[PDB]
Design a binder for this molecule. Structure first.
Ligand code: 7K4
Ligand code: CL
Ligand code: CL
Length: 371
């Protein structure tokens, strides 16, 4: 089981696609909801996502069917299409998934943030970095739910530099576009969700605190954080969770005016990657870095909660540290950073110590030596 948020709000969840095309925005929303008795949200909602995951892992598409059999009725504790909690403007987080992931696999993080009073828009990227995603080829296909699927693009070695950069820039634009969509919806622009879901988007009118916007992401999504920030001044800070820095152009390192927090796993990182993180540092710019002791790269995503301790450790979904303990540290450090850099009037400053790595399960800065 994926854990419930620790904050005082109930959390709801829905999906938004607009427009219906492969250049439109596709996101999963997590939001503070009213009390309700709605069903929990289906974690991986389509069989095609499991086929995509199979391709990502480099196995037979038949392994997709086994993953589906195993994980396909699993839920995450957000209430599907529950009404939005009225009477408050919420800060907004745009969330970017990793390579071979997709919008639904960072619910542990999304739910927790929402439970403390954020709206979270988890984008699904159409750069062919998602294991799978979908769109509709025309209006009629949208109306009848006739999906067209795009699966992960596998690259030759020779393409990696150029295409990964292409992808991160597209990811950035997708983050910007998703923000613009939510801002339009906030202002009251009618939006026809290409998904025909029973969640009225008019609820979100006047629900967004328009100036308090952050971008957060895992691995590829962490590089996405940095690109988005350099390109789009509406995002006031970023949190990169175990950023994979490789996709970023050399030009961007010196072009990130906003506060930026690096939260790393112990075992993922390596000098080449850390050096690039360090290139973002400058005495006029706000940067923090911590490393979660005993943690692995997948501690930041939901599959860390999907298996037992032994199978999970063997698969590198779990580290030495307990997955709940790890994500709690990342989530609370994140909340303190956000309160400080969006100017929130909450009690997240209670975890200010975590930003400085001041906890028995954290390492201030990094364990990686780079001299
Ligand atoms: C491919 C990466 C990598 C780069 C260099 C070396 C090693 C790995 C870059 C990247 O974005 N990564 C994160 C991918 O996270 C995922 C993928 C699929 C999932 F189902 C879930 C879940 N839950 C999470 C690792
Ligand atoms: Cl329901
Ligand atoms: Cl790892």
């Amino acid at each position: 089981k994926i854990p419930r948020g620790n904050g005082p709000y109930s959390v709801g969840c829905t999906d938004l696609m607009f427009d219906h095309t492969n250049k439109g925005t596709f996101l999963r929303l997590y939001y503070p909801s009213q009390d309700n008795d709605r069903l929990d949200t289906l974690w991986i909602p389509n069989k095609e996502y499991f086929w995509g995951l199979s391709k990502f892992l480099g196995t037979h598409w038949l392994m997709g069917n086994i993953l589906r059999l195993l994980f396909g009725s699993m839920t995450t504790p957000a209430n599907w299409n529950s009404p939005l909690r009225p009477g408050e403007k919420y800060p907004l987080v745009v969330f970017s998934h990793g390579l071979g992931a997709f919008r639904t696999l960072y619910s542990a993080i999304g739910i927790d943030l929402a439970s403390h009073g954020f709206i979270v828009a988890a984008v699904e990227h159409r750069d062919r970095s998602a294991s799978a995603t979908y769109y509709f080829k025309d209006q009629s296909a949208a109306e009848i739910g006739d999906k067209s699927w795009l699966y992960l693009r596998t690259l030759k070695q020779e393409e990696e530099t150029h295409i990964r950069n292409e992808q991160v820039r597209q990811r950035a634009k997708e983050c910007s576009q998703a923000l613009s969509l939510i801002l339009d919806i906030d202002h009251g622009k009618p939006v026809k969700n290409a998904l025909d879901l029973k969640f009225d988007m008019e609820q979100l009118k006047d629900s967004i605190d328009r100036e308090k916007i952050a971008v957060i992401g895992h691995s590829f999504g962490g590089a996405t954080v940095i690109q988005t920030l350099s390109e789009d001044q509406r995002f006031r800070c970023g949190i990169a969770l175990d950023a994979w820095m490789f996709p970023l152009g050399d030009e961007v390192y010196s072009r990130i005016p906003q506060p930026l927090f690096f939260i790393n796993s112990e075992y993922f990182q390596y000098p080449a990657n850390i050096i690039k993180m360090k290139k973002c540092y400058s005495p006029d710019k706000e940067r923090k870095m911590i490393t979660i002791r005993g943690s692995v790269h997948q501690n930041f995503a939901d599959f860390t909660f999907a298996t037992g301790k032994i199978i999970g450790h063997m698969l590198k979904l779990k580290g030495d540290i307990d997955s709940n303990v790890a994500i709690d540290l990342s989530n609370k450090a994140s909340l303190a950073f956000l309160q400080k850099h969006l100017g929130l009037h909450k009690d997240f400053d209670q975890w200010d110590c975590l930003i400085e790595g001041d906890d028995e399960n954290l390492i201030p800065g990094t364990n990686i030596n780079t001299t």
